[PDB]
């Protein structure tokens, strides 16, 4: 699995500056180009810039020519994006991605297809401050339903699993909604048959990263 692994998502007050990391495989770091594409509601996939580590060369999009800077750390083959003087609009998922072409003698096509992508880093550009959720049993009364209400956090996101991975079939982790209070609220469920509530015990595994919260809550 020749992969790309990224830093965690963050909340950032406007006018500040975030940096997102992109750690590669060595192969990728020698012979390919790594790009930063961001995606947000209302204008979708937006190219920002790209770096050729083997050359240390860069080419950013006009949209960011002063606020954005991309840097490598050869010691551990990590690429760094830094977007400066954050605006509200910057809020997005920022991906790093391998360009499809391998490097050529004469070069460098920064414009390229994107082969491999990382897993995503969600940058909330918000004046609100971090908050860890409060998880609450969703309790049942021949198939039953149960879950966990991951209520009241910030920013996005939280992840939810069941029995640290052992339960996955029938699991519905819903998309977070943003409340009038200004905090997020989420809901995971799983359906199981009634016979198993004598047999099996069910815990959800809630994890909200930017507050460093982790909870494991059993359900009746």
């Amino acid at each position: 699995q020749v992969q790309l692994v990224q830093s965690g998502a963050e909340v950032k007050k406007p006018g500040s500056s975030v940096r997102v990391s992109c750690k590669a495989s060595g192969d990728t770091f020698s012979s390919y180009s790594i790009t930063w594409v961001r995606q947000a509601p209302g204008h979708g996939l937006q190219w920002m810039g790209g770096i050729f580590p083997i050359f240390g060369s860069t080419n950013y999009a006009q949209k960011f020519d002063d606020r954005l800077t991309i840097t490598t750390d050869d010691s551990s083959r990590t690429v760094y994006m830094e977007l400066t003087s954050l605006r509200l609009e910057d809020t997005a998922v920022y991906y790093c991605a391998r360009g499809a072409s391998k490097v050529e003698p004469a070069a460098p096509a920064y414009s390229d297809a994107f082969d491999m992508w990382g897993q995503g880093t969600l940058v909330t550009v918000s004046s609100a401050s971090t908050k860890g959720p409060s998880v609450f049993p969703l309790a049942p009364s021949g198939t039953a339903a149960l879950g966990c209400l991951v209520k009241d956090y910030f920013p996005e996101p939280v992840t939810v699993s069941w029995n640290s991975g052992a339960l996955t079939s029938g699991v519905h982790t819903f998309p977070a909604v943003l409340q009038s209070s200004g905090l997020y609220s989420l809901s995971s469920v799983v359906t199981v048959p009634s016979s198993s509530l004598g047999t099996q015990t069910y815990i959800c595994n809630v994890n909200h990263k930017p507050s460093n919260t982790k909870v494991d809550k059993r359900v009746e």
């Binding site: 204008h43 309790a139 339903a145 809901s187």
Partner: protein, 213 residues
């Protein structure tokens, strides 16, 4: 700059039917400089096609690319269920530009939901808030209606819902409507119902509870 325009916005076709997606450029681009991507819910995009029509590795034969000039197309020659997703075209002739995606929605026969209403956990009540949850499980189509009522008094403005994406296996949706009240109000009332209205239901279904057990 070149402006990728994809059309239509959504495509709703059954498995085994052919999908064709249009991506138009604001000016002429060679076939060599085009990529297609697939994004399934909550993931990065996968490269499906580069240079107009070269399949990336591991990509099934049922995806093909074509076109040239200012009109490019991806055809999913015969849809799988698992091809429920959004799909993006990209010019990389100049400064990379992407379209705004096409969503393919996999058609299916009608499936009434199975409905489940959850009262508020004691640990939350000891905290002063009261969140009641109502689940609509595995229905199709996406059009459904959740009306909270408290002692036959119809609620409004206090409930939020969110909907899981189209399953890649059984192609249904699932929803989660949440009536929210103060611990105060939650005790002044007794019959907490949740009434569901969907195409698969002969007439609206009601689950409910009482504050008992």
């Amino acid at each position: 700059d070149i402006v990728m325009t994809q059309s239509p916005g959504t495509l709703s076709l059954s498995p085994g039917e052919r999908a064709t997606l249009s991506c138009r450029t604001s000016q002429g681009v060679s076939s060599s400089y085009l990529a297609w991507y697939q994004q399934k819910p909550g993931q990065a995009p996968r490269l499906l096609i580069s240079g107009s029509s070269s399949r990336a590795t591991g990509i099934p034969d049922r995806f093909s690319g074509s076109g040239s000039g200012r009109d490019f197309t991806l055809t999913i020659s015969r849809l799988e269920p698992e091809d429920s997703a959004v799909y993006y075209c990209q010019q990389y002739a100049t400064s990379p530009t992407f379209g705004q995606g096409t969503r393919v929605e996999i058609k299916r026969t009608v499936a009434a939901p199975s409905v489940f209403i959850f009262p508020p956990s004691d640990e939350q009540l000891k905290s002063g808030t009261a969140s009641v949850v109502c689940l609509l499980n595995n229905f199709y189509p996406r059009e459904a209606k959740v009306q909270w009522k408290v002692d036959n008094a119809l609620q409004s403005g206090n409930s939020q819902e969110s909907v899981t994406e189209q399953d890649s296996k059984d192609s249904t949706y699932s929803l989660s409507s949440t009536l929210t009240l103060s611990k105060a109000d939650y005790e002044k009332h007794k019959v907490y119902a949740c009434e569901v209205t969907h195409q698969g239901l002969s007439s609206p279904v009601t689950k409910s509870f009482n504050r008992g057990e």
